[PDB]
Nucleic acid binder design. Structure first.
Ligand SMILES: Cc1cn([C@H]2C[C@H](O)[C@@H](COP(=O)(O)OP(=O)(O)OP(=O)(O)O)O2)c(=O)[nH]c1=O
Ligand SMILES: [Mg+2]
Ligand SMILES: [Zn+2]
Ligand SMILES: [Zn+2]
Ligand SMILES: [Zn+2]
Ligand SMILES: [Zn+2]
Length: 1079
DNA sequence: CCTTAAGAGAGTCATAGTTACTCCCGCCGTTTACCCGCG
DNA sequence: GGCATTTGGCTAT
RNA sequence: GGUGGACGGGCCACCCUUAACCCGGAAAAGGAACAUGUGUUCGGAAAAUAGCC
DNA sequence: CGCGGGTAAACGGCGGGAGTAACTATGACTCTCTTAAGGTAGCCAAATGCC
């Protein structure tokens, strides 16, 4: 507990006095091992865990908190905070105690009949309150009565009694045949030839099943025989302190081997602490569980009244599978996909047939037949954990059944998908698994609907329905019936039913510890490309009936009755009973189709308007199938599509700061090196925050806090001074930076063009519940905040740009044309803005423009494997002119300290002096220079050039010039002079080369005498002291005869050599100072 | 052999505008306990 | 066997 | 005063005998499991549909 | 005596003015820096194809 600001702060420790609070933190970290020192301001004792924060506070500290101002007369009942006015207390309760203000609103809403003032007692009472209705109904037909009533109630009078029994009175083409004709016609020609004998018995089916299997094996034992090619290359005390050193080296080994083997899964071992455990549940337990789960045919009684969205479009299936279609789908398939239960990966298929012809034949043979071979209807299931909790490592549901099918079945399934997906247009409400940003269009739709309901004072009921095991419960009969009801061609229906025939899998738990076959009789084949589409098609009836017969939230003349994303469903309503209607429809579907939903796993809420505001859950919880829902009260949240929705505030903006700090701690505690931690962060941590930080509509306050945490952590990992420019971290690795992501400049751009994407969408219903002007101005705001043109702001409600297709009559069909993506405008290139900011700095940007877009001068920043990190960090410091030279140390402080060279007596000890001018390092300089010459020498010799290393030439004035190199081959003299010059401007290396060429152009008839040649070329070979490769040097490298790949390799080698020889020069300079100070 | 000015970023603090309400007030028509005409 | 090219992440379900 | 704690800075143990540690720009197992003191293992275990950067 | 119509008198609804807590955005400031491995070297990224 330091007492910032202090001049010679004693440690809260043994007692040693350190010279600075920062040095005190260093002493605590190293000598003691405490990383949580808290700093209290000297004046007011304000405590902050961050040092300089308190340091900056101190000057503006307005003395110790004294004589607390008068306490308002409104005290909160939760935190005892005083407020000046009643409105203040109400707003505090709303903004800090939502569960309290909710109940306050509910209590205020309820009416009563108190009648506080003017309670005129009626001498009438119960005894007569009922007797008067009885007697007024007694003597009826007699008009002009009361002669008996007054006797009944003599206590009252005549006219008033008459007043009282008034008061109380007041209250087609046969796609099979089409395929046959198409084949026949194509086979009469020589177009298709691979399997001509196996196609004729298919036309008039004789042994079609065996034809499928025989063709399969006859062409698949080949691709199997080449899997072994891949398997061949994949074959790969004295003292007790030795034990601890072995453990530490083992942890190192592990992490550094994973880092270069697969940096992925190392990101996940570090972050989320999810280890490589293999499930130890007995194979009998897993066997029985998954047998009873999957080998249990569902109960799909029927689809009832539920219909589907439109009719089928069988034209998609008519035209055949062409090689370019397979190429498109293969390029659209995940590259590093694991193999099925035979080992055949995508690479096997590609190598066995680069220009897909055999596959393009077998796929057509399957499709024309409606059957698939009995060797691909198999898959290997794996149980991969969900969390590393031993008590939950002995839990069955801590594992997932990821099912891997034969890849040649996954590819055919994708090909069949494209066509089935086109032929069956899903309901526009199903935003999952469709070609669109479903998650964004659902999160925005919810957020909006809620905000608009609150603003317009309209009831809104939301239920986050939860189907249990939607993919593992949807019966195959259900899918077949759904396909039939859309009148999809019976041939494709039969093909789908056959793709769901006699499937079995084994759930491998450990290496070679497999279960045996479990016939998958229920559920969609997870891992099969068609399964998402089939699930959407079997779930469409629910959405159709909900949108046609349910009662949903209305904004105008339209009604979103049910949003959906895959199995996720959100029911909406405009009343507590309309939501009961939607829930009843959902129950009907779930009881008629076999899907199971329980209100225990479902949540919801009900926003009911009041005079001032709304109330949440001011009613009984809805019941789904009998068990009441888990109504989400204010202050609680529910995860919808990865974001926490709180009915009190819409989207719960939380977790990003805590998650980022936890991840930074996890990375810092890893046995990784300074530039490996930066890679793990910029490639596997910041991306994880994008989704939440984008779809949650985070502002530039949290974005700046997160970016500040990232910057501090990175600059501490890399041992860069805090004053180092942001550009080096945020500039692209192609421009000399580290490539770290600037969230404050990225997330606004992502949000702006996400809003653009939502506005420019196909969901017509979705773009009616959307607040047009609010998102228009929000898009303008984010565009300006992202650094865009404040005048040329695109109109999100007009059209996108992109386009740029193969517009001119492309022979590619619609199934072969590569899928076109949409490219909405970006506000700006924030990375280029960061680099421009770098270039504008005058001291840390010295000559940085030479690294504008150079991949051969920044090759080391990306590929730094075999370089001591102590060298890499110094290279980074040199590139930003933040190396602790006395010139840099006396920055801003200026006169405060001396900038003179510590070794020589030069005016400024700039980073350029140490590398280029100081006599002390002259030896090293010479070595480096000669070394570079030698490299060039060797390169020239590899092309059989004669070399005159440092020749002794003399002119008339006896002025001996010594051109570093002279290459000669076939009557030519390439005089070359190497020079490693610090780059302090865009035209620095050019100037050096010009100087060399001008100072050696005197010797023409002298070089002719020495070299025995007539073509006396003169070239300067400038190199950057910080690793800048002059582009014109390629000319020389071309004259030597180097290839265009060895040219780039040698350019990278030269840049690396120059940079890391300058680093060594700087290190020698500092080490000489170190070795001389002790004297 | 070579070069030859530089602060930059991190952090509070103050001021002004926004969002999502809070609060009350007046009016405005509406219920409720006798009044009047009353056949 | 020199040359030419290429080379990732995250989110929802 | 010197050695050892892989290496540097500490800080410890011993006086050739080594128990415990901290930080690092250093750290590729004298660590665990299966077989008889020696070899093997420590998995690159991860699918699909869309989206995003 | 019943039946119509009027009725102050608190009070349910709805516009309207004023009002504030907690953010959200912009700007003006003010604060920090002195530490501390040397090193064989041998540029290999590293993989994959291709001709
Ligand atoms: C998360 C996830 C889901 N899906 C699909 C398959 C899943 O069956 C479906 C969602 O299933 P869930 O609804 O998450 O399964 P469940 O929670 O109902 O199971 P439980 O009985 O334990 O309650 O979405 C994927 O294809 N990939 C994924 O990564
Ligand atoms: Mg579910
Ligand atoms: Zn200490
Ligand atoms: Zn203070
Ligand atoms: Zn409070
Ligand atoms: Zn000098």
């Amino acid at each position: 507990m330091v007492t910032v600001p202090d001049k010679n702060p004693p440690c809260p420790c043994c007692g040693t006095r350190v010279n600075s609070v920062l040095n005190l933190i260093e002493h605590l970290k190293v000598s003691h091992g405490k990383r949580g020192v808290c700093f209290r301001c000297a004046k007011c004792g304000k405590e902050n865990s961050n040092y300089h924060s308190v340091v900056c506070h101190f000057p503006k500290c307005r003395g110790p908190e004294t004589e607390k101002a008068p306490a308002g007369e409104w005290i909160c009942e939760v935190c005892n905070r005083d407020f000046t006015t009643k409105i203040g207390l109400g707003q505090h309760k709303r903004l800090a105690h939502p569960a309290v203000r909710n109940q306050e609103r509910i209590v205020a809403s309820q009416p009563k009949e108190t009648s506080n003032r003017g309670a005129h007692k009626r001498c009438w009472t119960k005894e007569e309150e009922e007797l008067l209705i009885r007697l007024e109904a007694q003597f009826e037909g007699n008009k002009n009565i009361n002669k008996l009533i007054a006797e009944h109630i003599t206590t009252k009078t005549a006219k008033q009694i008459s007043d009282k029994r008034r008061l109380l009175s007041r209250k087609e083409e046969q796609l099979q045949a089409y395929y046959k004709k198409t084949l026949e016609e194509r086979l009469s020609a020589g177009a298709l030839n691979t399997f001509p004998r196996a196609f004729k018995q298919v036309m008039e089916g004789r042994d079609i099943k065996l034809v499928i299997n025989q063709t399969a094996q006859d062409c698949f034992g080949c691709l199997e025989s080449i899997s072994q090619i891949r398997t061949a290359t994949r074959d790969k005390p004295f003292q007790k302190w030795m034990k601890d050193r072995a453990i530490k080296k083992g942890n190192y080994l592990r992490f550094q081997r994973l880092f270069y083997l697969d940096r992925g899964k190392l990101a996940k071992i570090i972050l989320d602490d999810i280890e490589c455990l293999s499930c130890d549940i007995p194979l009998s337990e897993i066997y029985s569980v998954f047998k009873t789960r999957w080998e249990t045919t569902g109960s799909f009684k029927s689809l009832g009244d539920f219909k589907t969205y439109g009719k089928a479009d069988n034209t998609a299936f008519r035209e055949l599978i062409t090689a370019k279609e397979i190429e498109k789908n293969v390029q659209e398939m995940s590259k590093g996909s694991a193999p099925g239960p035979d080992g055949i990966t995508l690479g096997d298929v590609v190598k066995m047939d680069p220009e897909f012809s055999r596959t393009m034949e077998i796929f057509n043979l399957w499709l024309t037949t409606g059957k698939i071979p009995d060797m691909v209807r198999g898959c290997r299931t794996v149980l991969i954990p969900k969390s590393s909790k031993p008590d939950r490592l002995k839990d069955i549901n801590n594992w997932r059944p990821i099912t891997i099918g034969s890849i040649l079945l996954r590819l055919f399934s994708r090909i069949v998908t494209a066509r089935l997906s086109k032929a069956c247009p899903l309901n526009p409400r199903q935003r999952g698994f469709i070609r669109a940003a479903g998650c964004s269009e659902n999160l925005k739709l919810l957020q909006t609907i809620i905000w608009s309901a609150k603003r317009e004072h309209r009831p809104l009921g939301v239920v986050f329905v939860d189907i249990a095991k939607a993919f593992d419960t949807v019966s195959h009969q259900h899918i077949i019936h759904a396909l039939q009801q859309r009148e999809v061609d019976p041939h494709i229906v039969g093909l789908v039913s056959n793709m769901y025939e006699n499937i079995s899998t084994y759930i491998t738990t450990k290496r070679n510890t497999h279960t045996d076959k479990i016939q998958i009789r229920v559920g969609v084949k997870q891992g099969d490309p068609m399964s998402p589409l089939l699930f959407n098609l079997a779930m469409d009836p629910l959405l159709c009936k909900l949108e046609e017969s349910g009662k949903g939230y209305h904004r105008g003349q339209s009604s979103i009755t049910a949003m959906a994303f895959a199995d996720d469903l959100v029911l909406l309503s405009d009343s507590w009973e309309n939501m009961n209607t939607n829930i009843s429809i959902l129950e009907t579907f779930c009881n008629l189709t076999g899907l199971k939903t329980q209100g225990q796993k479902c949540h919801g809420f009900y926003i009911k308007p009041t005079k001032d505001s709304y109330t949440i859950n001011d009613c009984a919880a809805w019941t789904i199938n009998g068990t009441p829902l888990n109504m989400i009260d204010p202050g609680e949240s529910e995860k919808y599509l990865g974001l926490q929705f709180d009915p009190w505030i819409g989207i719960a903006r939380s977790g990003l700061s805590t998650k980022l700090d936890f991840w930074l701690q996890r990375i810092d505690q890893a046995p990784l090196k300074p530039l490996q931690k930066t890679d793990i962060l910029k490639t596997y941590t910041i991306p994880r925050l994008i989704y939440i930080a984008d779809h949650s509509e985070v502002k530039t306050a949290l974005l700046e806090t997160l970016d500040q945490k990232i910057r501090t952590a990175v600059k501490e990992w890399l041992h860069l001074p805090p004053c180092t420019c942001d550009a080096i971290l945020y500039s692209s690795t192609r421009d000399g930076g580290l490539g770290i992501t600037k969230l404050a400049g990225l997330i606004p751009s992502v949000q702006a063009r996400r809003l653009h994407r939502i506005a420019q969408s196909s969901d017509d219903t979705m773009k009616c519940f959307m607040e047009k002007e609010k998102m228009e101005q929000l898009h303008k705001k984010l565009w300006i905040q992202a650094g865009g043109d404040r005048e040329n702001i695109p109109s999100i409600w007009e059209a996108p740009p992109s386009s740029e297709p193969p517009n001119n009559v492309s022979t590619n069909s619609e199934w072969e044309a590569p899928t076109q993506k949409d490219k909405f405008p970006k506000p700006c290139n924030w990375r280029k803005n960061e680099f421009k900011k770098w270039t504008k700095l005058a001291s840390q940007g010295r000559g940085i423009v030479n690294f504008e877009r150079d991949k051969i001068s920044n090759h080391w920043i990306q590929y730094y494997r075999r370089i001591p990190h102590r060298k890499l960090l110094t290279a980074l410091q040199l590139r930003a002119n933040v190396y602790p030279t006395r010139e840099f140390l006396a920055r801003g402080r200026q006169d405060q300290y001396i900038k003179a060279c510590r070794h020589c007596d030069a005016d400024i000890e700039s980073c350029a002096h140490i590398i280029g001018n100081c006599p002390v390092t002259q030896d090293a300089r010479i070595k480096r220079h000669n070394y570079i010459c030698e490299l060039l020498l060797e390169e020239a010799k590899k092309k059989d050039w004669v070399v005159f290393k440092e020749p002794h030439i003399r002119d008339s004035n006896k002025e001996l010039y010594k051109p570093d190199l002279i290459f000669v081959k076939d009557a030519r003299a390439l005089v070359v002079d190497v020079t490693v010059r610090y780059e302090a401007a865009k035209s620095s290396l050019e100037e050096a080369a010009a100087e060399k060429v001008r100072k050696y152009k005197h010797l023409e008839t002298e070089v002719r005498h020495l070299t025995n040649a007539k073509d006396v070329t003169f070239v300067g070979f400038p190199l950057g002291a910080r690793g800048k490769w002059h582009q014109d040097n390629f000319k020389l490298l071309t004259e030597l005869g180097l290839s265009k790949s060895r040219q780039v390799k040698m350019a990278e080698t030269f840049s690396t050599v120059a940079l890391f020889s300058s680093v060594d020069i700087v290190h020698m300079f500092a080490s000489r100072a170190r070795k001389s100070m002790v004297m």
